[PDB]
Design a protein around this ligand. Structure first.
Ligand SMILES: CC(C)C[C@H](N)P(=O)(O)C[C@H](C)C(=O)O
Ligand SMILES: [Zn+2]
Ligand SMILES: [Zn+2]
Length: 309
């Protein structure tokens, strides 16, 4: 078996929505739960902070802080084993009996116009920040906004702070224009959950030009287990996920590929990747296609080679 790094799940959004109905220990309805993370042999799971687009502007910060509190109270020190990775040394020094968990921020909506709110989140240990979800916000346009604009000054100022703090700038969800501008501005670039658009043409995916640029930037691309972004017909299994891995390798990105499941953030599943406990069976499926060294690259080593430094 091999340890796993997965950059993106929406367990916090789901736990929050559940209103106490879900036990993180073992709830079957949670794609990511304690028992399943153990089964996965998880090394590091990214937990996104994300609010429904319908949480009003005046409550977004409160609800985000609530998610951070859910993380601290119900995820963290689960089994004593879940260990909060708040800085990159925490991961590099992680005890072998621990499973690392980091916070990431999916769109800067919760900070309003206040950079100090972002500072608070970074101090709290957020290690990757997506400037946008799908919508227009004060930092940039996300991919679903028809205007498709790039970065605002605020967006640029945010990226500068991220660079300074050795935090990833996450391009998943950005408009095409914001993507290109972000590559010029950001020092530590990741796509925490995006697939290849040549293989599945959803606008949420990255085209060949974008993928080549990511590689040139020495960025990480973390493939996502959502059938809608995996196959054009919307029905997908693990071999279909591998077609994206193949494609990125073909574009020169063997060492730039990781996993970003989007577990708990998706209405249906890739067959064979129904929940995070399926990870080990998926890695063995990979053995028909790639060497153990290459698979270890996808599972953890690529990400580990790209920590902000
Ligand atoms: C919690 C649900 C509603 C939204 C998630 N934050 P998502 O990560 O945006 C899932 C989606 C398919 C995507 O990645 O585009
Ligand atoms: Zn998410
Ligand atoms: Zn998302």
């Amino acid at each position: 078996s091999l340890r796993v790094i997965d950059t993106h799940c929406d367990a916090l959004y789901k736990l929050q929505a559940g209103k106490g109905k879900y036990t993180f220990q073992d709830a079957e309805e949670l794609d990511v739960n304690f028992e399943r993370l153990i089964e996965a042999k998880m090394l590091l799971q990214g937990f996104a902070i994300f609010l429904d687009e319908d949480i009003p502007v005046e409550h977004k910060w409160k609800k985000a802080v609530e998610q951070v509190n859910i993380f601290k109270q119900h995820v963290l020190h689960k089994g004593g084993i879940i260990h909060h990775v708040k800085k990159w040394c925490d991961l590099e020094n992680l005890p072998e009996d621990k499973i690392g968990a980091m916070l990431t921020l999916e769109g800067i909506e919760p900070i309003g116009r206040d950079l100090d709110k972002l500072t608070q989140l970074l101090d709290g240990g957020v290690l990757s920040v997506g400037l946008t979800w799908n919508n227009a916000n004060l930092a940039a346009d996300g991919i679903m906004e028809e205007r498709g604009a790039g970065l605002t000054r605020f967006g640029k100022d945010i990226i500068h702070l991220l660079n300074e703090r050795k935090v990833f700038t996450d391009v998943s969800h950005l408009s095409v224009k914001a993507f290109w501008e972000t590559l010029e501005q950001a020092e530590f670039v990741i796509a925490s959950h995006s697939n290849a658009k040549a293989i599945c043409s959803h606008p949420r995916n990255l085209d060949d030009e974008q993928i080549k640029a990511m590689i040139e930037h020495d960025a990480m691309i973390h493939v996502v287990f959502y059938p809608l972004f995996t196959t054009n017909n919307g029905v997908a299994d693990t071999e279909d996920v591998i077609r994206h891995i193949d494609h990125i390798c073909e574009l020169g990105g063997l060492k730039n590929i990781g996993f970003g499941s989007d577990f708990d953030g998706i209405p249906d599943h890739v067959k064979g990747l129904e929940h995070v406990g399926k990870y080990q069976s998926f890695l063995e499926t990979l053995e028909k296609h790639y060497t153990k060294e290459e698979i270890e690259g996808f599972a953890s080593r690529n990400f580990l080679n790209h920590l902000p430094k």
